[PDB]
Amino acid sequence: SAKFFVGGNWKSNGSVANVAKLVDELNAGTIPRGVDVVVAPPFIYIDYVMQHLDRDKYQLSAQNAWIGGNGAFTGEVSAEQLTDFGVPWVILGHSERRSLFGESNEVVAKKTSHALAAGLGVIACIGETLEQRNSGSVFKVLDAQMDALVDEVKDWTKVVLAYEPVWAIGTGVVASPEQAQEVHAYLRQYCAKKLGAAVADKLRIIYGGSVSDTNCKDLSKQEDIDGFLVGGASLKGAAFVTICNAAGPKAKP
Amino acid sequence: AKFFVGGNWKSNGSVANVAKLVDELNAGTIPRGVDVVVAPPFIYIDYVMQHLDRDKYQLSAQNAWIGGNGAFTGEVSAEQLTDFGVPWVILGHSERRSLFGESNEVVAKKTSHALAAGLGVIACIGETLEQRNSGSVFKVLDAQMDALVDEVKDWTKVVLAYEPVWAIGTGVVASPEQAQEVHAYLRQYCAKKLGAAVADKLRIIYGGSVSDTNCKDLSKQEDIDGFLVGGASLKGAAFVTICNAAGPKAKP
């Protein structure tokens, strides 16, 4: 069992007209019954998307959350401020923060366990780069990114494990179905050792490559691909709704 | 001069408190002719803008991204703030510099980028306890203020906030004479490099452990044009008191 998870990370994008336009487009789309669909607008627009996105079809998310609680931390938004505000999800550990802000695995893991205890669900992101794929380090790279999460996370009920290959995040070369499946199969039978196949067969291992309307078809057929983390297509309305429909029989109604 | 009173709520807030603070801020009266600026965390900027008094307060962002839009998970751009209605943004806060590693040049780049995007910047500077105990104070500000003068090409919409790191949450307050000495250096160092035409008009506000108690004594000093308030900005009654510390430094 794994309700298909399509995550639409808008990333640092959007105007007043565009967010209201994308809300109208996402509201006009029809999502198949039994699919978790989560949009993640940048912090300032959450109050509006919370108030204007159709509550039955989508749930909200935040693109980041502070490692600690409240206090004197300028700029950061706490994981407690979010649950009280009404946001149910948060993306922690994107490759645009592991690299550009120096967020290590132990920080992202601690960032997730603090957000879990704050009452949130975490779309915990992992993945290697072009530097690591060629050197064959994908074996170690994910096992070190994952162990930190296992070292911290104590309840995977609300965790969604996104595999974003950085050599495929912003560059448009979507990892082929047989590539992004051989990695997802690892994470499944890897979470079976540390946790236990009962938890692993229930966990959602979505995919966070360069997903579009075209290529989600052949990815969603793969066994250990339980969903998508969509970035560029999530800014286009019907482009996101198409990918939210590629679930098929993996959608528990 | 237009006495500049900032209020940086920092990583604080709830649905009740943020709402409660706007009622407390809308309640008190602000002297006729004072620039007062509050900076809630990002998620509450919508509510405050639609509830805080237009005619008595202005909004501010606690941070902005060094670049424009694009694939940057989490961050908020300077363009995303001007179209939203925000007129101000605090950049280079001492908690940003130390915890997240905002380099001296990044903070300068963040200030000129946010200026060219239609915003105004409350530029932050200051030294640590490591930097006063070794006497590196005047060297640090010269380096932090130089990098700005490099990027910033119009100081019309820039408020320069001095923030002693040793005098933040510690509770220690840079005494009225300690914070007037520094505020006077920065002015003759802005006449240095931008001429006395820019320096006299520029707003240099003090950003230490300001409260309704010790705001009366710092507001009288010569080169102190206001305050960055962090902790006392969360009490609507105490913050409006500090906004009245202006007196003749504002007038209309």
XYZ file of C-alpha atoms in Angstrom:
505
model
C 0.000 0.000 0.000
C 1.269 3.441 -1.020
C -1.022 6.322 -1.990
C 0.669 7.899 -5.011
C 2.539 11.055 -3.987
C 2.961 13.843 -6.548
C 4.859 16.785 -5.061
C 4.966 20.075 -6.911
C 7.895 22.184 -5.743
C 7.353 25.642 -7.235
C 10.792 26.793 -5.982
C 11.699 30.486 -5.639
C 9.207 31.562 -8.310
C 5.949 33.415 -8.734
C 4.378 36.867 -8.853
C 0.992 37.967 -7.541
C -0.634 37.356 -10.925
C 1.197 34.079 -11.560
C 0.411 32.467 -8.197
C -3.252 33.450 -8.520
C -3.194 32.191 -12.115
C -1.561 28.903 -11.098
C -4.104 28.543 -8.290
C -6.920 28.908 -10.836
C -5.276 26.329 -13.107
C -4.601 23.835 -10.314
C -8.179 24.363 -9.130
C -9.500 23.670 -12.630
C -7.620 20.379 -12.898
C -9.214 17.099 -11.841
C -7.047 14.820 -9.691
C -7.850 11.076 -9.522
C -9.372 9.863 -6.266
C -6.779 8.502 -3.862
C -3.607 10.450 -4.687
C -1.694 12.678 -2.282
C -0.918 15.869 -4.219
C 1.082 18.581 -2.455
C 2.110 21.995 -3.784
C 4.929 23.931 -2.110
C 4.859 27.683 -2.777
C 7.503 30.023 -1.347
C 6.747 31.197 2.193
C 5.139 34.552 1.373
C 2.421 33.025 -0.828
C 1.363 30.219 1.540
C -1.355 32.274 3.260
C -3.005 32.865 -0.127
C -2.577 29.359 -1.563
C -3.852 27.994 1.753
C -6.930 30.201 1.348
C -7.618 29.667 -2.369
C -6.447 26.180 -3.390
C -9.175 23.537 -3.324
C -8.808 21.807 0.045
C -10.068 18.425 -1.191
C -7.660 18.066 -4.132
C -4.352 19.438 -2.788
C -2.528 19.838 0.502
C 0.052 22.529 1.151
C 3.766 22.420 1.939
C 6.705 24.648 2.798
C 9.949 24.584 0.850
C 12.124 24.638 4.000
C 12.041 24.818 7.793
C 14.550 25.872 10.439
C 16.590 23.186 12.198
C 15.621 24.567 15.616
C 12.527 25.959 17.255
C 11.715 29.649 17.609
C 14.031 32.178 19.238
C 16.320 34.814 17.762
C 16.962 33.425 14.264
C 16.408 36.115 11.635
C 14.911 35.033 8.309
C 14.187 31.421 9.226
C 10.690 29.982 9.667
C 10.342 27.440 12.460
C 8.770 24.009 12.096
C 6.393 24.923 14.942
C 5.280 28.146 13.238
C 4.154 26.004 10.297
C 1.975 23.404 12.033
C 0.211 26.167 13.960
C -0.268 28.052 10.679
C -1.884 24.955 9.126
C 0.793 23.630 6.735
C 0.983 19.803 6.773
C 4.150 19.127 4.738
C 7.651 20.521 4.259
C 10.509 19.698 1.890
C 13.727 19.201 3.861
C 17.050 18.385 2.256
C 16.692 19.626 -1.312
C 19.865 19.482 -3.406
C 19.543 23.269 -3.832
C 20.216 23.576 -0.081
C 22.539 20.628 0.576
C 24.880 22.277 -1.965
C 24.151 26.016 -1.950
C 23.757 26.356 1.843
C 26.060 23.532 2.953
C 23.310 21.424 4.546
C 24.912 18.099 5.457
C 23.102 14.797 5.919
C 23.292 15.028 9.714
C 21.765 18.516 9.575
C 19.017 17.464 7.147
C 18.357 14.380 9.279
C 18.149 16.498 12.432
C 16.109 19.006 10.415
C 13.626 16.204 9.687
C 13.347 14.644 13.153
C 12.697 18.095 14.629
C 9.997 18.774 12.029
C 8.423 15.344 12.582
C 8.144 15.960 16.332
C 6.713 19.410 15.532
C 3.710 17.704 13.924
C 4.767 17.840 10.257
C 5.257 15.463 7.358
C 8.650 15.601 5.657
C 9.480 15.094 1.982
C 13.055 14.097 2.787
C 15.174 14.485 -0.357
C 18.338 12.569 -1.234
C 20.434 12.020 -4.360
C 23.899 12.011 -5.917
C 25.495 14.391 -8.428
C 27.314 13.973 -11.727
C 30.540 13.969 -9.697
C 29.308 10.958 -7.711
C 27.434 8.937 -10.356
C 30.475 8.519 -12.614
C 32.787 7.537 -9.751
C 30.316 4.752 -8.843
C 29.848 6.398 -5.451
C 26.040 6.118 -5.676
C 26.330 3.032 -3.462
C 27.945 5.003 -0.629
C 26.389 8.416 -1.307
C 22.811 7.336 -0.609
C 23.726 4.949 2.223
C 25.398 7.873 3.998
C 22.513 10.223 3.212
C 20.048 7.583 4.402
C 21.794 6.381 7.567
C 21.565 9.887 9.030
C 17.796 9.802 8.498
C 17.594 6.347 10.095
C 19.878 7.642 12.856
C 17.322 10.401 13.587
C 13.845 9.554 12.265
C 11.863 7.473 14.762
C 8.453 7.293 13.023
C 8.307 6.965 9.233
C 4.501 7.255 9.138
C 4.746 10.824 7.810
C 8.001 10.568 5.801
C 8.202 10.634 1.996
C 11.661 9.766 0.648
C 12.384 11.682 -2.564
C 15.271 10.592 -4.799
C 16.470 13.640 -6.729
C 19.537 12.833 -8.872
C 21.322 16.178 -9.098
C 22.806 15.216 -12.480
C 19.133 15.230 -13.490
C 17.542 17.963 -11.341
C 17.920 21.146 -13.364
C 19.619 19.861 -16.497
C 16.670 18.208 -18.263
C 18.191 14.752 -18.712
C 15.519 12.851 -16.796
C 16.982 9.641 -15.417
C 15.602 6.903 -17.641
C 12.936 4.604 -16.145
C 15.380 1.700 -15.801
C 17.906 4.034 -14.146
C 15.547 5.691 -11.640
C 14.105 2.240 -10.829
C 17.384 0.426 -10.122
C 18.030 3.133 -7.512
C 14.510 3.034 -6.055
C 14.767 -0.744 -5.708
C 17.925 -0.226 -3.644
C 16.264 2.226 -1.250
C 13.349 -0.186 -0.778
C 15.414 -3.249 0.144
C 17.808 -0.937 2.027
C 15.051 0.442 4.273
C 14.104 -3.212 4.788
C 17.406 -3.938 6.560
C 17.615 -0.878 8.825
C 13.874 -0.586 9.557
C 12.046 -3.750 8.478
C 10.181 -4.776 5.303
C 6.869 -3.933 6.985
C 7.868 -0.257 7.123
C 9.666 -0.286 3.763
C 6.758 -1.739 1.765
C 4.557 1.035 3.213
C 6.992 3.931 2.727
C 6.598 6.176 -0.331
C 9.809 6.453 -2.361
C 8.845 9.159 -4.854
C 11.125 10.375 -7.654
C 12.494 13.884 -8.010
C 14.134 14.120 -11.423
C 13.147 16.350 -14.331
C 9.557 15.140 -14.639
C 7.246 16.487 -17.345
C 3.933 15.559 -18.956
C 5.654 13.145 -21.342
C 8.074 11.066 -19.273
C 5.996 10.472 -16.123
C 4.161 7.733 -18.054
C 7.129 5.356 -18.297
C 8.390 6.172 -14.792
C 5.085 5.583 -12.997
C 4.954 2.034 -14.401
C 8.169 1.079 -12.592
C 7.723 -0.975 -9.439
C 9.490 0.990 -6.694
C 8.449 4.448 -7.969
C 5.586 5.570 -5.716
C 5.294 9.138 -6.986
C 7.056 12.271 -8.158
C 8.726 15.454 -6.971
C 7.962 17.909 -9.779
C 9.749 21.246 -10.037
C 9.531 22.972 -13.403
C 6.250 21.458 -14.596
C 4.591 22.282 -11.256
C 4.574 25.958 -12.276
C 2.350 25.113 -15.267
C -1.198 24.160 -14.295
C -2.376 21.361 -16.581
C 1.238 20.177 -16.795
C 1.073 19.274 -13.101
C -2.429 17.770 -13.346
C -1.231 15.423 -16.101
C 1.506 14.038 -13.843
C -0.947 13.726 -10.936
C -2.958 11.401 -13.208
C -0.055 9.103 -14.202
C -0.657 7.221 -10.917
C -2.982 4.559 -12.298
C -3.407 1.432 -10.169
C -0.873 2.719 -7.599
C -3.617 5.078 -6.326
C -5.330 3.648 -3.246
C -8.847 5.227 -3.352
C 16.646 62.296 9.594
C 13.115 60.875 9.970
C 13.877 58.752 13.073
C 13.921 55.127 11.871
C 12.524 52.587 14.353
C 12.793 49.003 13.155
C 11.179 45.969 14.723
C 12.603 42.563 13.830
C 10.365 39.844 15.279
C 12.892 37.175 14.169
C 11.938 33.485 14.133
C 8.884 34.089 16.339
C 5.137 33.997 15.966
C 1.893 32.081 16.122
C -1.599 32.625 14.756
C -2.578 34.144 18.109
C 0.555 36.166 18.918
C 1.078 37.680 15.456
C -2.577 38.705 15.416
C -2.376 39.923 19.024
C 0.717 41.999 18.240
C -0.969 43.749 15.304
C -3.848 44.748 17.592
C -1.321 46.044 20.125
C 0.614 47.845 17.382
C -2.552 49.305 15.853
C -3.609 50.442 19.337
C -0.709 52.694 20.319
C 0.035 56.064 18.758
C 3.193 56.892 16.793
C 4.683 60.422 16.617
C 3.614 62.334 13.510
C 6.663 61.996 11.264
C 8.520 58.810 12.226
C 9.546 55.916 9.985
C 8.438 52.771 11.841
C 9.074 49.375 10.254
C 8.126 45.897 11.494
C 9.515 42.688 10.000
C 7.496 39.542 10.730
C 8.638 36.145 9.443
C 7.692 35.366 5.869
C 4.474 33.409 6.412
C 2.795 36.256 8.349
C 3.677 39.084 5.931
C 0.303 38.638 4.218
C -1.832 39.001 7.363
C 0.153 41.930 8.780
C 0.008 43.867 5.510
C -3.788 43.428 5.429
C -4.281 44.241 9.124
C -1.504 46.543 10.331
C -2.205 50.257 10.002
C -1.191 51.533 6.558
C -0.803 55.140 7.723
C 1.340 54.387 10.802
C 3.545 51.381 9.933
C 5.455 49.863 7.035
C 6.421 46.234 6.484
C 9.793 44.566 6.010
C 11.229 41.205 5.041
C 13.626 39.472 7.410
C 15.851 38.325 4.512
C 16.012 38.100 0.728
C 17.775 35.883 -1.790
C 21.074 37.000 -3.314
C 19.712 36.334 -6.811
C 16.415 36.830 -8.574
C 13.880 34.065 -9.150
C 14.694 30.598 -10.475
C 15.251 27.137 -9.059
C 16.122 28.049 -5.441
C 14.193 25.824 -3.031
C 13.171 27.674 0.114
C 14.439 31.176 -0.563
C 12.471 34.334 -1.364
C 13.679 36.759 -4.028
C 13.881 40.538 -3.906
C 11.559 40.680 -6.927
C 8.991 38.512 -5.113
C 8.855 41.156 -2.358
C 8.352 44.406 -4.289
C 5.452 43.049 -6.349
C 3.992 41.736 -3.082
C 3.914 45.189 -1.448
C 6.863 44.897 0.967
C 9.008 48.075 0.921
C 11.881 47.053 3.224
C 14.173 44.109 3.951
C 16.771 43.403 6.650
C 19.939 42.004 5.080
C 23.107 40.775 6.735
C 21.788 40.358 10.268
C 24.444 39.158 12.702
C 22.566 35.873 13.133
C 22.581 35.404 9.348
C 26.308 36.166 9.083
C 27.418 33.745 11.818
C 24.981 30.822 11.601
C 24.397 30.622 7.838
C 27.751 32.057 6.751
C 26.504 35.136 4.888
C 29.860 36.443 3.685
C 30.751 40.128 3.848
C 30.506 40.364 0.055
C 27.289 38.332 -0.163
C 25.631 40.798 2.227
C 26.881 43.634 0.021
C 25.685 41.834 -3.114
C 22.355 41.128 -1.406
C 21.975 44.846 -0.660
C 22.591 46.188 -4.170
C 20.499 43.431 -5.765
C 17.581 44.154 -3.427
C 17.978 47.889 -4.069
C 17.841 47.500 -7.856
C 14.720 45.328 -7.419
C 12.751 48.258 -5.966
C 13.214 47.590 -2.231
C 14.875 49.443 0.614
C 17.534 47.814 2.766
C 18.188 47.998 6.491
C 21.885 47.135 6.189
C 23.354 45.456 9.275
C 26.932 45.633 10.569
C 28.742 44.989 13.827
C 31.483 43.082 15.602
C 31.662 40.006 17.815
C 33.057 39.558 21.323
C 36.188 38.118 19.702
C 36.435 41.393 17.769
C 36.130 43.875 20.654
C 38.421 41.966 23.029
C 41.202 42.141 20.419
C 40.485 45.762 19.492
C 39.569 44.787 15.925
C 36.392 46.906 16.112
C 37.306 49.743 13.763
C 38.947 47.293 11.348
C 35.785 45.180 11.122
C 33.378 48.032 10.357
C 35.782 49.460 7.774
C 35.763 46.111 5.965
C 32.003 45.583 6.265
C 31.233 49.175 5.236
C 33.732 49.172 2.328
C 32.151 46.123 0.629
C 28.819 47.964 0.779
C 30.189 51.183 -0.678
C 31.459 48.887 -3.443
C 28.059 47.478 -4.448
C 25.583 50.125 -3.275
C 25.266 52.858 -5.909
C 22.404 54.786 -4.267
C 22.093 55.275 -0.504
C 18.672 56.937 -0.723
C 16.884 53.733 0.363
C 19.531 52.312 2.739
C 19.373 52.442 6.541
C 22.676 51.430 8.136
C 22.100 49.522 11.386
C 24.950 48.979 13.849
C 24.554 45.705 15.766
C 27.146 44.732 18.397
C 27.062 40.932 18.561
C 28.261 41.013 22.186
C 25.179 43.172 22.903
C 22.301 41.212 21.346
C 20.437 38.514 23.287
C 23.123 38.676 25.974
C 21.200 41.637 27.401
C 24.292 43.842 27.592
C 23.492 47.228 26.039
C 26.166 49.255 24.287
C 25.971 52.220 26.689
C 24.880 55.593 25.223
C 28.522 56.660 24.928
C 29.766 53.316 23.590
C 27.159 53.339 20.799
C 27.629 57.046 20.040
C 31.372 56.553 19.522
C 30.669 53.917 16.867
C 27.793 55.825 15.273
C 30.108 58.821 14.880
C 32.863 56.770 13.229
C 30.446 55.385 10.634
C 29.272 58.884 9.687
C 32.721 60.402 9.167
C 33.516 57.164 7.318
C 30.486 57.635 5.063
C 31.563 61.231 4.431
C 34.945 59.609 3.725
C 33.712 57.643 0.752
C 30.289 59.085 -0.172
C 30.776 62.735 0.790
C 29.106 64.659 3.587
C 26.066 65.167 1.337
C 25.141 61.478 1.624
C 26.288 60.915 5.208
C 24.214 63.653 6.855
C 21.005 62.427 5.201
C 21.753 58.756 5.911
C 19.986 57.013 8.802
C 22.307 55.126 11.167
C 20.240 53.241 13.747
C 21.481 51.298 16.764
C 20.633 47.620 17.010
C 21.473 46.262 20.446
C 19.358 45.177 23.420
C 17.073 48.167 22.952
C 14.100 48.362 25.309
C 11.651 51.001 26.508
C 14.013 51.606 29.445
C 17.304 52.436 27.704
C 15.807 53.802 24.472
C 15.413 57.281 25.988
C 19.171 57.535 26.622
C 20.399 56.293 23.234
C 17.912 58.447 21.314
C 19.510 61.655 22.623
C 22.992 60.816 21.321
C 24.132 62.805 18.309
C 24.655 60.197 15.574
C 21.871 57.786 16.609
C 18.917 58.110 14.224
C 16.792 55.275 15.584
C 16.792 51.646 16.639
C 16.697 48.095 15.429
C 14.499 46.392 18.040
C 14.519 42.595 18.331
C 13.090 41.460 21.649
C 11.094 44.528 22.695
C 9.467 44.473 19.237
C 7.248 41.569 20.348
C 5.445 43.673 22.979
C 3.154 46.151 21.248
C 3.179 48.512 24.223
C 6.963 48.528 24.682
C 7.665 48.905 20.954
C 5.372 51.927 20.601
C 7.223 53.485 23.544
C 10.510 53.091 21.661
C 8.871 54.666 18.602
C 8.239 57.706 20.821
C 11.926 57.889 21.795
C 12.382 60.063 18.674
C 11.227 63.443 19.940
C 12.930 66.248 18.020
C 15.028 63.793 15.965
C 11.944 63.318 13.752
C 9.364 66.160 13.983
C 7.332 66.167 10.806
